[PDB]
């Protein structure tokens, strides 16, 4: 299961990956799952969250 | 489309969201899409990437 970078991306944090268009990438499996941008109705705060940590 | 936090999560970076179990969350749509942990076969580097930036 291999992918390829459509555009350049420069990292904005210490945990993301910088790459250039054409690079070949493999998805790594982690226990955290996909990450989503979320808004907390409880706190009003907003930011990325690990999918597996929540349920509908 | 609302979810609820199964576990506490403490933020590790400046972009993720800290929350506590039971919090209610709403997914925000961004152009970047889901984020995945990836390994670059081209560079050997590893880190999170925005889904929409790549194709199989």
Residue numbers in the entry:
A (entry chain A), B (entry chain A): 84 to 139
Please quote the authors directly:
The non-receptor c-Src tyrosine kinase participates in different signaling processes by phosphorylation of tyrosine residues in a variety of proteins, modifying their properties, such as enzymatic activity, subcellular localization and stability. The c-Src tyrosine kinase is made up of six functional regions: (i) a N-terminal fatty acid-acylation domain, (ii) a unique domain, (iii) a Src homology 3 (SH3) domain, (iv) a Src homology 2 (SH2) domain, (v) a catalytic domain, and (vi) a C-terminal regulatory domain. Of all those, the SH3 domain plays a key role in the regulation of the tyrosine kinase activity through the recognition of an intramolecular Proline Rich Motif (PRM) and, additionally, through the interaction with other PRMs present in other proteins. To better understand the mechanism of 3D-domain swapping formation in c-Src-SH3 domain, and its plausible implication in amyloid fibril formation, we have solved the crystallographic structures of the WT and three mutants at position 128 of the c-Src-SH3 domain.
All the crystals of the dimeric form of the c-Src-SH3 domain belong to the hexagonal space group P6522 and show a single chain of the c-Src-SH3 domain. The intertwined dimer is generated by symmetry, and the structural motifs of the SH3 domain are formed by two polypeptide chains: residues (N-terminal)–111 from chain A and residues 117–(C-terminal) from the chain belonging to a symmetry mate (thereafter, chain B in the intertwined dimer structure). 3D-domain swapping of the polypeptide chains occurs as a result of an open-like conformation of the n-Src loop (Asn112-Gly116) which acts as a hinge loop. On the other hand, in the Q128RD, the longer side-chain of arginine displaces W3, while W1 and W2 are placed at the same position; and in the Q129KD the sole water molecule conserved is W1, which is placed at hydrogen-bond distance of Lys128 and Glu106. Thus, the amino acid at position 128 is responsible for the hydrogen-bond scaffold around those water molecules. Interestingly, W1 is the only water molecule conserved among the different structures: it shows very low B-factors and small ASA values in all the structures in this work. All the intertwined dimer structures described at this work show the presence of a PEG molecule at the interface of the two chains forming the dimer. Whereas the WT did not show a large pH-dependence of the Tm, our results confirm that: (i) the mutation of Gln128 to arginine or lysine, which bears a positive charge, results in the stabilization of the c-Src-SH3 domain, since these species unfold at higher temperature than the WT; and (ii) mutation to glutamate, which bears a negative charge, results in the destabilization of the c-Src-SH3 domain. However, at temperatures below 20°C, we did not observe the formation of high molecular-weight aggregates after several days.
